Structures are given as structure tokens and as C-alpha cells.
Amino acid sequence: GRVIRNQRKGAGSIFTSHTRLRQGAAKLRTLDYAERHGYIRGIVKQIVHDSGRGAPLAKVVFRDPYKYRLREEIFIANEGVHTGQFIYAGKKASLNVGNVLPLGSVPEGTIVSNVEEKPGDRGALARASGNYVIIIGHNPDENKTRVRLPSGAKKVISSDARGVIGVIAGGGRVDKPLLKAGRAFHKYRLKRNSWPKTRGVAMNPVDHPHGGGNHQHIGKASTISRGAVSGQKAGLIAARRTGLLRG
């Protein structure tokens, strides 16, 4: 009869993300006239490390088109992007790794990253390290582009949505064992409080639906309805199937 650990996560007190050492939000440049009609040249100044993020972050300086000053945009660095490299962003930009282009102005089978779902949301898709979006189709009439997502999902998005050529740098990061609890400790120390995880079968019945009993066991099906309520969704929620991928 006690509020369980996943229900306490939404109150956001000790389960907030640890955001002191992060460099800022990584976004694309704002979709302005220069990117909508031509291109703009920025410069990679630093490739830095973002805390909690597996991917390195490029700091790219553009000239402000309407005032005399410099705008520093924070990009997710694509693999091969180097300091001092010019980055071109706009409809008329070229097919180079690091360049920011609308997806309608881009051929088929092109690998892109930091892809807007809607034109002007400044980067939504394929942002984690090593991830990319394949362009798998164009529907020029009532402009739409079919893309393939890193989960394998096909998705039709707008041709005016912008992506960045290349894959996200930092790939292969989950290819290393952590080997030890301290490396997971320092990994999650700058993400958020979600580790270590006590199992619900190891708790009392007051703490979890899986809690209690004279042996640690579940006792009802771990598969939970989508139409179940908070406190009940502790297991394999709305599972179409279970078990190993074996035919």
C-alpha cells in the first residue's frame, strides 16, 4: 500500500537529471531566411565532451545575418568533423559530412543525423552516439520524405525538415563491458538517479507488486495491460510476445 519506485520518479525531486556539467542543449541553428533560401558558413571551433552524453559536441560559430556579432551553436559532432572545418547550413549547402541540409534537397540512401521531425524543431532524431537516419524515399508532390530510423521504423517526415550529413560520433561506446559497479556508478552519477536497481521480487508486498512471499517469485503474469494504472505497470508492459528471439 506504499507508492512504488517508478511512481516516485515523476515527482522529480531526486530523479531529476544532473545538469551542472553539461555544455548546453544541442540543437540545430534556427530555421531562418539564410538556411531557407541559401546557405550559411559556420566554423568548428571546439570539439568538447558533454557530461552524461556519449557523443562529443561541436561548437560552431556562425555570423549573425542581421547584427554584427557571432552566434555560437552547439551541434552534436558527426564522425570526421574536425576543428577549423567550415560547416555549411542551408538549402544550397553541399553533400559533405557535417553540413546541414533540408531532406528534400538530399538524394536517396543518404545518411543523416540530428534530424528534425518537423521543420524548425532544431534536431530530434538520431542523436545518440553512432546513430543515423537513412533517407529511403521522396514524395515531391505535397513534399514528404520517407526516412528509416535507428529502431528500424519507417517514418514520413517533411522535406523542409533539416538533417546533418554523417553519423553521430562516439559509436561503439556500448561495445565495452563496464566490468564493475563503479563504472556504472560514474556513468549514472552524471546522468540521473536510476541505479542501482533493487528487484521488485526482492521487496516486501508493500513496496512492489512482485514483492513478498516465502520465495522470490512473481506469482502473476509479468505482462501488464496498456490499460493498467500507475502502481500496476511493473513488469513487461503491453508485451506483444515474450521469451527469447527463437523460432
Next chain:
RNA sequence: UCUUGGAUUUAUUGAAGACUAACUACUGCGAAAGCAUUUGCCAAGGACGUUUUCAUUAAUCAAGAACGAAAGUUAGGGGAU
């Protein structure tokens, strides 16, 4: 098993992965395992030709090594048949 929620079949436009038919032979190349679409680059090789050059530098080889179909193993990718 699929099928009036139109299967199978027909047309058009795609995507993906493998494979490289027919030509293909008592034909070729490679130390062998092997190697068959095109083009480019890169290093190599046999045979022939030579009134070039060096002049026994060679033959086979315990130990030692490189390569070694398929299946299989480990970890990613890919996953059409």
C-alpha cells in the same frame, strides 16, 4: 497454408540482400584451398624472346613458419533466398 478485408495472376514504380546464368569447353589462371558482370588503381606471376647480366648462388628438406573448402566460435553489421 493463403484467400471476396480480392489470394493466385496482370501492369507500373520501388527497396533490400545475395548471386553472377546462358557464353562455359576433356579451356585458362593460381602453391594449394580456390578463382567467371564492367571499369579503374595497386603490387605480383608464368611462359616465350634475348649474341643482356651474375656465375654454383642449387635439389629435397627434421626444427620452424605462411596460406588453407565447408561447417563451427566470439563481437558488431546485415538479414532477400
Next chain:
RNA sequence: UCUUGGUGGUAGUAGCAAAUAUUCAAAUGAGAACUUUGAAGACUGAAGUGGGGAAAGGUUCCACGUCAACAGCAGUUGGACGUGGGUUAGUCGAUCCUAAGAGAUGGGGAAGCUCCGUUUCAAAGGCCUGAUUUUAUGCAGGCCACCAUCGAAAGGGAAUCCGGUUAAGAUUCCGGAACCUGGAUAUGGAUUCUUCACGGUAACGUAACUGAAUGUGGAGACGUCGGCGCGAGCCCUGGGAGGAGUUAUCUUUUCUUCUUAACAGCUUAUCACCCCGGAAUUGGUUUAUCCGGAGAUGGGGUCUUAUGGCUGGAAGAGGCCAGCACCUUUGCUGGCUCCGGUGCGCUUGUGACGGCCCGUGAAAAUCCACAGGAAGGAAUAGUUUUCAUGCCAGGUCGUACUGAUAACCGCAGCAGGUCUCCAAGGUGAACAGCCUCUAGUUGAUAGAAUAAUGUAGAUAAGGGAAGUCGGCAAAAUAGAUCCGUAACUUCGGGAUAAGGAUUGGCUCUAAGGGUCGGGUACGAUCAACUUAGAACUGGUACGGACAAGGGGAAUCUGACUGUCUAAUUAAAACAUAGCAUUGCGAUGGUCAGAAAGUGAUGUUGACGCAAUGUGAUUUCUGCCCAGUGCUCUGAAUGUCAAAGUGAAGAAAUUCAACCAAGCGCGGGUAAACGGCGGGAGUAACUAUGACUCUCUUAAGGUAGCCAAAUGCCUCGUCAUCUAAUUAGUGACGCGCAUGAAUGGAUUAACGAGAUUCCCACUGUCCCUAUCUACAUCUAGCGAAACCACAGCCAAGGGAACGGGCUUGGCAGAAUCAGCGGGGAAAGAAGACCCUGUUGAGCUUGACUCUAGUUUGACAUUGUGAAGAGACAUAGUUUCUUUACUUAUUCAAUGAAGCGGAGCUGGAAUUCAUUUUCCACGUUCUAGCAUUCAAGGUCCCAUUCGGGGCUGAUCCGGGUUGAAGACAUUGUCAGGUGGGGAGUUUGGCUGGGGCGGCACAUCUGUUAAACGAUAACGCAGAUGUCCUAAGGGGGGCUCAUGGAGAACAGAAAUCUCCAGUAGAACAAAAGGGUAAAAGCCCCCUUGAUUUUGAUUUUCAGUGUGAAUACAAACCAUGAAAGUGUGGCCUAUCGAUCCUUUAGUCCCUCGGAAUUUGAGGCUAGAGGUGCCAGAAAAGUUACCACAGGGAUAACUGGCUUGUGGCAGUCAAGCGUUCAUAGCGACAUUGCUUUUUGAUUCUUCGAUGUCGGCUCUUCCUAUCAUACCGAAGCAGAAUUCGGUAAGCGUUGGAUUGUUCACCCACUAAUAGGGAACGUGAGCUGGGUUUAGACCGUCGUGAGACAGGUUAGUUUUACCCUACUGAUGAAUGUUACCGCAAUAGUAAUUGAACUUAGUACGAGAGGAACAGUUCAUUCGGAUAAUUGGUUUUUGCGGCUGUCUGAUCAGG
């Protein structure tokens, strides 16, 4: 267990015993263990008992006075009491900045208190003018797109040091010497006739050397570890100049002073850079291996100033001395304060590097620089107050003291707790331990004595775990050097494996450095601690104190490191990496919030977030989709609500069709929950069963593993381990009840985990003893628990265990030290068990709901179409989709470039027309891009400048995109919803639970001849059945037997005789019944209506059932009569509500009519727990009220059962009942078995076993004396008197019990609250933690297995053991002995004697002597043990200068 207050006994008692320790004198004082001073002795031993601070405290600081209380003794003293005094800042902090975060406003939400939100969807804003007289400077232009505020006395940050000074303040006061900020402001220098400096190739330099808007950059501003290098301070050390110590002796000796701050000038560096140069024969180079044609080495330079040097500060200060003054005011005068060295030293700062990360290790205020070029200034002068000097100011608050064995929190002056800085010498690896210096303390109630029992520390012959649940506790080992080092292994380890040597002192030796250099065959000099070797030496000692691993062989278990139940469980539990599954592509997943223009993940995006399971590596993860869950564009006339539609109705309304999701149907899914069988026949063995068959399955337990922490039986069987093993290990496996990510098997390493064995080692034990330090007595001080009254027993009875009562024993003041038998001692209204119509935690398919979610409808909600959209010259909305935007919604931005038209070029082949299109100034490069923009063109009224226009196309003022009448939101409707809420979870009962129903009933009996009568008494029965099995009438007689008839018999039909019921009557059993109540036939509905009376249950209520009538109407028979269900005794049901029948009756209250409703009378629908709630579990996490009305353990009664006896004598005993036995029977005893009971205790009598220790019984095992024998001897067997005296050591098990190895004279049985826990122990059981197996959906259960789990108090009374003692004239000595206690026990050998006896085989006893066992009482000559004799000697470290002598 009343409330408040007061007071006792206990009681002058328990105690005032941790932190090594005090002592002598004098002074003061009434009074000194405790105050002060001297002296001595000690300690903290620089991670301090020292010197300061942070929090907290708040005057405790300091002085004077003073002791009533407080300082658990004292007090003259005090952190006490009384009275005062004391905290000084431009520089130290706060103040300021931001951090995680807090929070106004605008705005939205909320009935509201208030919530959200923090730049959001706001008309959110104040700053310089280039420097002056129409200016309190503004009524001039011009710029900034930022957005409250709070938030750190440890982060960031402007600037102060030294010396002196108080009773108490100081980086704050004084003296000297600085520095910073803000302001004003001149002078000197610099700069200008080339207006805004000059030099250097350059890196860069300098005393300056204009510089607005705007932009850019830097600093602020950053992890951790390692070695290296440098600096500071400390340490060590040499010379010299002073002072003190020692000086029988030695010691150019031992100690001590010898200092230089902030700030300032000049210099000084790793790194970095620049110039020249052009490198392979590759060079330079770090402890660490990096660097060089992207220019090395080398040769010149430049720079930062960490840091150091010199100087100023500044010797005048500070220190050490000397001499003279010696109530001198109070000093005066003089001297010296100097020169080195050393280093893996210690601490700290710092540099350049290296390593680590799926971790890459704050922000802001603030300050500076650069870019730019607005603007302004060159001749008796302007600019810079970034050069120097000069002038003024710097507020407010804090500031004392402690920072703890006495200033803080813990009830207190409490052995607890509470953050940090500094940091001497030696030993030594060391910030260990030990000793010492500076500094600090010597505080803690004392004195005397040295009993028991303690606590703390020890030692121990011989044995060496025999102790115990268990090696618990202790001992053993230990540093370093050298040697040696197994299995196994994840190849990293294991590992200090195991084991073995050496070690002191002294005197030497050999190695290992730094400075030192060359001709256009050569060594002075300086310093250090490491290693190796050798001789000599000694009571063979030597890591000499201190400090300091026990090891090995295995098993179970969890990989490891880690975390955890604060205050009983540190684990095998949790976590972990690894593995796997699930959801989710954002108008989304998961989760918040009452709502919201609201949130967490999210400064996020599938290599991610979220939910789970399993738990490293290795190896594997089998089969099952029936169940349940989950899921699926899955089937769309199965079910279906609200709205809506249709019919009928006067209408309310009723009926009908349609009817979304969900459920139903079908599919998928087990690393979802889970589950994974029996029997028979079979091989040329007997069982065994590759195979086969049906029985049900969804599949039938696979690979593996196993009496496992999982196996009941079970201590399973075999082997091994031992003398002996319920232990361990290895096997075996029809496995109560093993098994595969509810993970199976393995596994190196690891473990304060559990277990077995072995070596070492030991007081664990045999078997105890001794020693040291800290109860007793005293002076002082002085509680508490508890207490009906009290305190000697035995027996009886008694609420079945008395201190009191009864009958006996008896019994003499006052006591002290012990002690644990009793006070069913104390501590707590029993946590176990039960009850209560008392709860709570938790679960679920309980009952009833509910947040949320999902689906529909209506509203928001407008504008068009197509319209297989309505009902056959016929319709804007109607069972399908897409068009519009302006509502709504989402999103972004400094609301910047949207939409539509506008020059050319052409692969439009200008078809004389943009039916018609595309391109809108930027892609080698880490530069730069700003001043309403230069240009061009026009006007000013011209003023050294200004204004237009174009450059830069017009027009629409839709910021831009998405989405769209769908989302959203509101209301209602259906579904889902242990997420959450509330509640329930009957009773009786030889305790409760399970079972049963003895809960409403009927027959017989129990039941004791009226009636009534109990038990979970006995044997049974009821919840029905019947249109006849009811009613009436009539005829007949049944069961059974005998005697006869073709098939035909024991049984088929027919005939006769007998037949009192032996048959039948629906169903139990009892009663009843013969021209019937049975059987068969005929006619029927009296099984009807009305409403009373009565009987039985009983209260003389109800209900059920029955009796007899009365009023009718009927049936039947000729009739009398009978019939108001069943031949009689059982066969059943309130109120409320619904429904039907009856009158056509009452009411709808302003009057009606008609529907509808309500009513009156009679039934039905149902309460079986049957006088009638609507109802699942669990609790070992538990709670409360109680209960001895009631279980678990003692006692009591009983004695089936257990144990022990007797009588009788069939029969056994070669013949022979009774030597010894003894069947079939039968009579007893006991209370050490287990039942039976529930009398005592539930405001608690401590629950198993062992250890220890005493006594008692006798039903006698041994020993003594005897009787009997199928007693020749020997050895046995039976029995008597007898409890005097003994009755053991071990292996396994927690055990009791058992079983085995031994030894013995024998290893008898019992009791004493199943003797004995304020005697212990805690292995077991029986709290809370954890694992397994089975069970359960689950929470959870299991007299199943396993592991871990706080054992309190005596000082009171008695009892006991010891010890005093008043009174008897006093005192003293010597005695007596009533009474009480009593103590010795058992064996062997020799001789008897190889004798008696015996055919032999074998083989005694008494007497005698010698010893021994167990017990007891002493004792210490000897032997051993003990050592504070601190007696003598030795040894380590340190200290007293050495020695001697010591601490």
C-alpha cells in the same frame, strides 16, 4: 497497578574502583589529602592532556569580595555566589557574486487559504550628450532585445605588515612602515612645427605615449593519482662570539642566543617564442621516449617573475650578555647579534610531465586587453590625471572566552557524540608502539588491611582437544635477508603457499659519488648512506622491550570489491558487471498534479529513456500456448449503455430495430505467470525392460545434479575417514517433494559466511595450583528495586506444592561476612493459545466502490462538395471520403524577409500571348565583415554640414510553419480499474483448527412404567413423492406352504386345501388395519369456500402440523354415513419489496374525466445458520480488551497404555509340571512411559538437553553373608537379608533415547516443580533477517530441511556455611559430655596350588604376605608448579653530558 502531596522500612546500606601517582615543606586560614608557592616524583609524548579556530553556547573571559546552596569527600578554591571591568578594523569577516536551489511580477488555475511558473503568450528599459551660459544640463540626437529578488562567515572576491602594549583587546590600540578603492586636482616629465611616442630583423622593449558606439578575446575558472625537479619553513651539522649545566674522573664537552615582516627597486626560470643555420654516419634527450625539413642539434637572443639573491624597510626593532645603580623618577651605559655546510629527510607551496575514465572533473560578479575609428586636440599652449609626485575620504554589523574526560548536544561538571589547521628529537619502513624536549596537566572521595567470590593481567610438571554444540577463549606464528615454493587456474594468480636457515656487539675491508682540465704518459678537494664480505667476541645470545600471518586437505554456498536490519540477525540476504525480455519515433513511452497557458525523464531521441527478470567467467538453457495473463490491419447481425430512430398510445411511457469499446470467437506469445503422468505384456536370466499397447495429456521432467542448505522413511546402502562416527567426504538413485535466466551444472580468485579432517600449539580438559592490580574495616557522602502482614520446619487437609490453619517437631537478646535452596522472589494488566459480533498491516476471482484510462453521444462547431446520403419531375443536414479557414490546437522566433506580381538566357526549337518554366551576389584555406553605407542623383539657403531618393523592385500590413471543425475541453453513458478506499470473512465443539451437524426436524432407544429430561449418546430418517398413492362405494383376501396339470423343472400358468397376517399400506422406524386401512373395479375432486375455536411444540407468542365443529357448495353410496388431502407420528418460512387473485371497493387532499400510482383481503417469489445480516483470505511485523470460563510445560485425580509383581499349571526341560521355564486364563502394584481430564496458574511459577552439586528410594548391576540348581571343579543361573559403599573414559548426534570402541568389581533402575538458568551454557525448540523443497493465484503456510539471532537484579527475610556476642558476683584456668555428625572402599599379584574336584579338558577357595583403586584427613623434608624477594644476573629502546648509579 486511583489522583496530588508528604513520609517510611530497606539503610548509614548498595555504592562513590576506567583514563599509571603522588609526596615533603612553608604560607594562608577557625579548620588544608584536595588552595597558593617552592621542592621532588610522574604523565600527555607534536594524529598531544600543546597552540588556534568552525558550529553551538553566551559573559562562562578578567579583577575584587566571598562560601548558605552547588562542585555525589572536602574546600580557605571554583566555569559557583556578590560587585564591577572588558570585545576599537578603509585592509580580518559579513556586506557583493553566483551554485544546487528558493521566489515575486505578467499570466493561467483554484470555492478559497493559495497553486503553477521564472522569461514565460506583457506596451516590462534607463544610459552616455561629442563637453558649458536662451540649460534646475536638456524640450535635440545616439546606443542596449537584456528582464525582480534571495541563496556560501569552507566556493569566487580590491587592499596591512612588523614591533610594542592590557587584569582581561588586538592583522582592530600605539609607534613605524605600506597598500587599495572612490573622489578632487595641480606640478614635473612625456607627446605635438611629420599633430596622437620611439627603438629592435624578430621574439619583444620602455616612465608616459588620444581612443566613443559596437564586437571579440583573456583572466575570474577549477579532477585525481604517480614519480621527478625547484623553493620555503623545520630537522641535522661545522666554525666563532656570549650565557648556563657537569666536572672524584673523563669530556676543545651538554644545553641555549646568534632574527629580519608586509611593501619597494634592481636582478633572477622551467616552459614558450624569435633570428641564423640546414641535419642519415640520424641527432638531441627525460627517472619515466618523446621531439626534429611543419626546420633538430648547435650559436645568439626574447619573455612570464612561481621562486630566490642584493638593497631599501632595518636595527633605531627583537634577542643574548656585561657593568653600575639597587623605596634610584625608575633604570642608565656598553658590547655581541657573524660566517658556513648537508640531504630518496619531514611538512607545505609549486613546476614540467605521465597515467586514468561509457567519470574528461561550477557559475557569476568583477577586472583587463584587442579590433574598430566616432570625436577632440599642435604656439607664451591643449591631451594623458593607464608616467611620477601632491590633496581628501573610507560607513554599518561581528570581534571577550570555551570549543570539550567541566563553557556544545546527550535531564548532569556524563568514559558517549561533535568539523578543521600547525606538528621537535631517538628507535624504527613508519604520522605504529616505546622513551624524551617545548607547552600543558598532575584532575578523577580518601586512609588502613590484603579473606572468600569477582574484574583485569599472568604463569604452569606430564599429557596435548581426551574439554565443548563447536578449539569458544588462549597459546602457537610474526619484522627483515637468503633459500625453497604443490594442486588448481579465468594464465592474471594461488603465494608471505607450504616449509627451512640467518640476525647482537666490536674491529675492519670492498664497492657504489660531486666538484674538479688540457698540446695554434694526471690528481688534489668535498660529502652521503646503502649493499656485500671478513675476523674477533659472548652462559649459542641477538626483529633480545616494543612491534608483529598459524598453516594445510576438502565440502556447501555467494563470482569478486561493495551495501544492510542505528539499539539482539553483516549473512548464503541486497547490489554488482554480464545476460535477456518489454514499451516508446514526441500532439510519444513511463511517471507526477485538485486544476492549469502545470510538471519529471528532458540542457533527453532507440549505442536513448522507461519497466522488469536473472545475476562474473565457462558450458548449457530441453518440452508444453490446455489454464491464466498479455497481445493481434485480426470475425463483424453473438452480447451491448446513453443519445438518436421507428411503432402504438391522449400522453406519461412501453415495445422494437440499430448499437462503440469491452467481453465472446479466432491467432500469436513461456529469458509471461506457470506446468512437465500411471499400469500391463515383453530378451534362449527369475525379477530388469531398447521395444509395444491402451488410460487420460497442453506436454508428460530433457541435459544435468542429488539422502544436496532440497529425501519423509532415514542414523537409507556401499566405500573411505576413526579404536569407536546420527558428523565429513566419494559413490548410488522409481528423486515424500531435484532440474534448467521462478536459471541447470561447473568454477580460478575472494569471504569477521556454514561444515569436516590433519599438523602446529596450548589450563579447553585430566586437575587443579600460584602471583599482581583494582569486596572487607574506617572518615565523609549516600540512593534504589521492592514491601498485605510477615518470615524455622515435617505431615495432613485445603483452589489437588503453606510463613500463617491442624497435629507434631520445637523454640533464647543483638549480630557480621558470604551464599544462591526457598520466598511458586523482582522486573511487564502473557508477545504463545482461546474469546470479543476489538483492530491494523498485507493479499486476492471476497462484497461494495473509486482516481486514472478507454469507447460512444451531445456541446464547443462554422463554410463546401461528392453524395452505393430518406420514403419512389421528390429535399442545405442523414449509417463513406476529402475541400476552406476564421474558431480551436501544436510549434518557433530579436515575431526579418511570407505570399503575389516584376530584367534577361533558353534543348519555350520566341509561332507574333510568360495557356507555359528554372535561376533570387556567398564552398581550396581556423583572416575580416559594425558607425541611418560608400557611390550616384536632388534639395537646403550653406554653417567646417544637414535632409530626400536610389543603392537595397513593387503590392497585401496574414510574424512564420503545422493542424483543422478533427483534436482539445465540458457533461453524461458503457467498459476497464487490489493502483487505491471502505467493510466482511456464522455457531456448536472434552482448547482451537480440520471433520461432523448433535443449528429447523421425524421414529425407536438412552429415559429411571404420568409428563419433561442431557452428551460430538446408540440405530436410522427429512428438504421428497402422488390426479391418485386424495375421497366415496362395492367385491375379494394376503405372505408362505402342501397336494395335483402337455411343454413346465426350484422358479411361467391353472385347481384345491391350509394359512390371525408371519403380506401389503410411496419413502425411516414405531404404532394401526382382515366381508380392511391390503388387493381389484366403478364414480369422482372435500387436495374446494368463509372465518373463528382447540391440541402439540410453547412465553401457553409465532411458524409448521393436527383435532373437532359451524355456515355454504359438492362428491360418493340404496342408505346410515364418510370426505376440509395422503391410515397416524416428519416432509418446511416473518417484516420490507415484487407479483397474482378478489370487490369494481377506498385514495390521489381546488373540481373532475381517463391512464398511472397507492391502499384493503388472500396466496406466491425466501431467507436450510430453517424467529429469517448482503460478505474471501492471511499475519512469524503485529495491536488492544480480557480469559486460568480455554490449549502449550509442573503439580493433582485416573492407569487404558507403559513398567514391575503374584496365583493356576496345559506343556518344555534326555524320564520329570514347578532346577530353570511356562501357554490358555486371572489378581494386583507403581507413577520413572504415553494417553485421559481441565482443578490450580494467562495484572507471566523462565519453556529442551548438558555441565555442576546434594540427598532420597529400592523393583540389587557390583561388593558382604547366605539358601537352591539340570551346583563335580571352574564359570554361570534362581532366590534371601541388604541401599553400607560404588556404578567410568570416549566416537557420532543439540538431543533425551540410541549405538559403538574401550576399561572396570560393576559400568542397576529411578525420584527430588519431567531436582537444579538472579548456578552456568544456549547446541536445540519458540519472535523479528535469509535460503530451499512441497503447498497456496497471492499475501503466506509447513510438530519439513537449513543458517544467524541482547540470557537482567540479591545489599532484604529465611535456609545454609563460617564469624562475634548481652545476660548467669567478676575474672581466669582445667575439664565433663547431652545432643548432632561420622568413613573408608574395591581389586590384583605371590603363596595356598596346577592342589581339592575332575576320565580328561580344565581348575578353586579360606588363612598369610606384598601392593594397588576410589574416597578422606592432614602435611611441605624432598620433587614439581607459582615469583612484586621486583633478591641476583642478563638484554632492547629512550632519558639523566660520559662513567658509575639509576628513571
